[PDB]
Design a protein around this ligand. Structure first.
Ligand SMILES: CCCCCCCCCCCCCCCCCCCCCCCCCC(=O)N[C@@H](CO[C@H]1O[C@H](COC(=O)CCc2ccccc2)[C@H](O)[C@H](O)[C@H]1O)[C@H](O)CCCCCCCCCCCCCCC
Ligand SMILES: *[C@@H]1O[C@H](CO)[C@@H](O[C@@H]2O[C@H](CO)[C@@H](O)[C@H](O)[C@H]2NC(C)=O)[C@H](O)[C@H]1NC(C)=O
Ligand SMILES: *[C@@H]1O[C@H](CO)[C@@H](O)[C@H](O)[C@H]1NC(C)=O
Ligand SMILES: *[C@@H]1O[C@H](CO)[C@@H](O)[C@H](O)[C@H]1NC(C)=O
Lengths: 240, 255, 202, 96
């Protein structure tokens, strides 16, 4: 029994309209909307006992629910406020007490989108010193100058995603920590065997999925619209 | 001879916010308990209403009913949300639960539920079910109620074990009030009628006789209650003969 | 709140056991569920306790429930790096969809990994594109090493991050440093940190 | 939905000047919300007692109202009931 949510991250502006969607194909009649905040457990916003029905939860104010079908349940924020910056979870269930939770949606509500920037991505090749010393090769990835911290960094080897030998910073850095709306920098490492890096047939790619502006968002600035995009850098193995 | 024990629950749901639940308990035609919406606790209406239960056993049981009253209320409200817009307020729910005590250790337990004054649901065996004539939309509420294994196990225990146990003790403790005799007093009147008041127990004989021959015409009214737990009866249409267990052969003949 | 968890947070070493508590005032208490939530991710059910006095087990996890005491304990036997998560206690007030879930605010657990054979070293890695750009990588250091942020604003230093080469049952710690300034080199990169005496500079 | 039935009867045989008890048994109504008043000369009697509301095997509600009274040849006694099933209240006079 699975639940899907869209989008994964969302950046909105104060007074803007935000729709968080939830989908399930379990033929579950009942669906629920929660928000998770630090120092709090999950709190019920709205729920639904079937298509056409919406019921107020414990903290409904500022939210509207829509159950247009058995599968879809939406959380509508008609006038987004910064207090609605949170992680939103959706769940579904049948007549039983089990609620099957979705993966989440991190929403960030800003005063304006004038400081949104996609990342620059660079891959740094293993040192020959490390190779001879440890018979291991660490690749380093660097995502720089992005805002907000709505990014998913992943490593791809020959077009397939890897998790083994990977470590990404749990938190990004502030590039200009004196400035209030500072851009971030995030780093990640991928360690392989020296003989794996030695193979010139192996293609390494560091990919960063950025969550920024949508087609519907307005943009009146000389620089390119900082839309949701993938930014990546590559490297090929080498005998050298 | 055979006494029916019944817990009668009356739950009114005026709207989303307003609700009240009031219960009364009877052993035959004698009230044993009252539980008003206003009261946190169940009240005894007889000195012997606790039966043969200990103060601790009574308290553990009362605590269960207190949790049940609050929980039942929210469950009905959540079931109305689930069924909207098909079924809406005002809603009346009557619940009748208890058991019949027969000669020996024989007992039959029941739990009947009426919605809007019509019997629709019962608890039967190990689960809730709808009865013939019930509307089909009740299948979703029954499915949801039957998902609650914890309530089902509790209800099975109360009907199969607790109710018979409690009533055997209640029959002992209340023997003197249940087996009590009260002499009926009769008076005649007719406007262009045989009034019989104050008898206990309920079984009575009231007849209009033309000497030794009875009259087929005579219409025995319904048993009307007195506020001192005795009964009132009328017989309409010459003498009025009344035969009651309290008279012990000495029948009342009113010309 | 009706559901309270203890401790708020804790730090344990790999192979140690963790004991997590949950206390509630929820009435009625049909069942208690323990969830594991990894940072940024969602909720994964570890176990459900349903009886008056209950005990459950799921591998390295085991739990108890005493409905009279309105208390539950979660045990993690021989904690692993992967157990670094938030553990959430939830009490359900009905045995059906008519019920409300009452959520505890969680317990954050940090597991310190076992670094088998340390080899502290600082390597210089060059960009696959430009050439005129690089990073300093401080790696293979033991857990008793703290990486401190740079005293210089134009120099960026990340915190400790532990990777696991699962196929080789090998774990390694590392921090990255970079700067676009000329006065920056790897021999001096982690100067503001207390790094081991053996640290290899090639 | 369900219209009420009112029955007014004395506890003991009536005798002018002697104190008795008048009973008013209201039956067969739904919903259970009801308002019952007993009257002397068209004026509400203050010390009226109400039994707890209950229901029969047929699921219909019932309630017994009763007050002490000393009948006379001039005094009129009644039982007025207001229920949603009726537009106007139903008054039933005591007749010996
Ligand atoms: C039958 C008579 C017995 C003889 C005793 C004589 C005493 C005389 C005093 C009488 C005064 C009371 C009069 C009131 C009338 C009562 C009628 C009998 C009804 C008895 C029902 C008892 C159910 C008990 C369980 C309960 O409270 N359960 C509630 C909470 O449940 C929760 O908490 C539980 C938690 O439950 C637990 O922990 C119970 C433990 C426990 C503790 C102590 C003892 C036993 C068990 C457990 O964990 C559960 O898993 C959990 O979910 C649950 O919410 C009740 C739902 C019942 C709904 C049934 C109505 C049918 C509706 C059909 C109409 C549909 C209309 C549709 C609308 C559109
Ligand atoms: C309570 O009594 C009922 C009988 O009224 C028991 O119900 C039977 O349960 C078994 C399985 O346990 C079924 O095979 C039968 O079909 C049930 N009978 C009916 C009429 O449905 C019930 O098990 C008893 N429960 C307890 C806990 O004593
Ligand atoms: C709910 O019902 C009660 C009793 O019938 C009434 O007094 C109250 O005004 C109602 N509330 C609403 C919100 O209509
Ligand atoms: C019935 O009782 C509950 C709990 O005691 C209370 O919240 C509710 O308001 C009461 N209903 C009425 C109509 O007084």
């Amino acid at each position: 029994a699975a639940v899907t949510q869209s989008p994964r991250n969302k950046v909105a502006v104060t007074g803007g309209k935000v729709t968080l969607s939830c989908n399930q194909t379990n033929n579950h009649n009942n669906m629920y909307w929660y928000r998770q905040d630090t120092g709090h457990g999950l709190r019920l916003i709205h729920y639904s006992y079937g298509a056409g029905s919406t019921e107020k939860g414990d903290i409904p104010d500022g939210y509207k629910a829509s159950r247009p079908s058995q599968e879809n349940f939406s959380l509508i924020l008609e006038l987004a406020t910064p207090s609605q910056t949170s992680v939103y979870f959706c769940a579904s269930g049948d007549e039983g007490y089990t609620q099957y939770f979705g993966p989440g949606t991190r929403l960030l509500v800003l005063e304006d989108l004038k400081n949104v920037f996609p990342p620059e991505v660079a891959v740094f090749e293993p040192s020959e010193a490390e190779i001879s010393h440890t018979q291991k090769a660490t690749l380093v990835c660097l995502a720089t100058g992005f805002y907000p911290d709505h990014v998913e960094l992943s490593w791809w080897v020959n077009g397939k995603e890897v998790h083994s030998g990977v470590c990404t910073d749990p938190q990004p850095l502030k590039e200009q920590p004196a400035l209030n709306d500072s851009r971030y920098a995030l780093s990640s490492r991928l360690r392989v065997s020296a003989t794996f890096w030695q193979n010139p047939r192996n293609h390494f790619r560091c990919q960063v999925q950025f969550y920024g502006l949508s087609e519907n968002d307005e943009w009146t600035q000389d620089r390119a619209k900082p839309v949701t995009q993938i930014v990546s850098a590559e490297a090929w193995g080498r005998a050298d | 001879k055979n006494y029916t024990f019944r817990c009668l629950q009356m739950s009114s749901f005026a709207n989303r916010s307003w609700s009240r639940t009031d219960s009364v308990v009877w052993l035959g035609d004698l009230q044993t308990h009252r539980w008003s919406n206003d009261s946190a606790t169940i009240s005894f209406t007889k000195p012997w209403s606790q039966g043969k239960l200990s103060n601790q056993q009574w308290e553990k049981l009362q605590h269960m009913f207190q949790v049940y009253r609050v929980s039942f209320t929210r469950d009905i409200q959540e079931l109305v949300k689930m069924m909207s817009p098909k079924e809406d307020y005002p809603i009346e729910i009557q619940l009748s639960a208890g058991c019949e005590m027969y000669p020996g250790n024989a007992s039959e337990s029941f739990l009947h539920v009426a919605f809007q004054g019509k019997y629709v649901v019962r608890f039967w065996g190990t689960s809730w079910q709808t009865v013939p004539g019930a509307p089909s939309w009740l299948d979703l509420p029954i499915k949801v109620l039957n998902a609650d294994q914890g309530t089902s196990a509790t209800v099975q225990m109360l009907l199969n074990d607790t109710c018979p146990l409690f009533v055997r003790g209640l029959l002992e403790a209340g023997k003197s009030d249940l087996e009590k005799q009260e002499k009926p007093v009769a008076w005649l009147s007719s406007v262009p009628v045989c009034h019989v008041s104050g008898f206990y127990p309920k079984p009575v004989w009231v007849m209009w006789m033309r000497g030794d021959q009875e009259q087929q015409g005579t219409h025995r009214g319904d048993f009307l209650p007195n506020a001192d737990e005795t009964w009132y009866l009328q017989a309409t249409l010459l003498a009025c003969r009344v035969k009651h267990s309290s008279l012990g052969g000495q029948d009342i003949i009113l010309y | 709140t009706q559901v309270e968890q203890s401790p708020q947070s804790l730090v344990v070493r790999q192979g140690e056991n963790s004991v997590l508590q949950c206390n509630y005032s929820v009435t009625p208490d049909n069942h208690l569920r323990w969830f594991k939530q990894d940072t940024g991710k969602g909720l994964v059910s570890l176990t459900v306790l349903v009886d008056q006095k209950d005990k459950t087990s799921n591998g390295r996890y085991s739990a108890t429930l005493d409905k009279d005491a309105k208390h539950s304990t979660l045990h993690i036997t021989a904690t692993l790096l992967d157990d670094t998560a938030t553990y959430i206690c939830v009490v359900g007030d009905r045995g059906s969809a008519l019920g409300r879930l009452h959520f505890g605010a969680g317990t954050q657990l940090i597991v310190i990994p076992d670094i088998q054979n340390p080899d502290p070293a600082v390597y210089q890695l060059r960009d696959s594109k430009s050439s005129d750009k690089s990073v300093c990588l401080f790696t293979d250091f033991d857990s008793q090493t703290n990486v401190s942020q740079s005293k210089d604003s134009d120099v960026y230093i990340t915190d400790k991050c532990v990777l696991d080469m699962r196929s080789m049952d090998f774990k390694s710690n590392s921090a990255v440093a970079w700067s676009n300034k000329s006065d920056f080199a790897c021999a001096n990169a982690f100067n503001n940190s207390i790094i081991p005496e053996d640290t290899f500079f090639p | 939905q369900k219209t009420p039935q009112i029955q007014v009867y004395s506890r003991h045989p009536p005798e002018n000047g002697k104190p008795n008890i008048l009973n008013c048994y209201v039956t067969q109504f739904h919903p259970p919300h009801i308002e019952i008043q007993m009257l002397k000369n068209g004026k509400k009697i203050p010390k009226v007692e109400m039994s707890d509301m209950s229901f029969s095997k047929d699921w219909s509600f019932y309630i017994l109202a009763h007050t002490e009274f000393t009948p006379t040849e001039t005094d009129t006694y009644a039982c007025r009931v207001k229920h949603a099933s009726m537009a106007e209240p139903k008054t039933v006079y005591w007749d010996r």
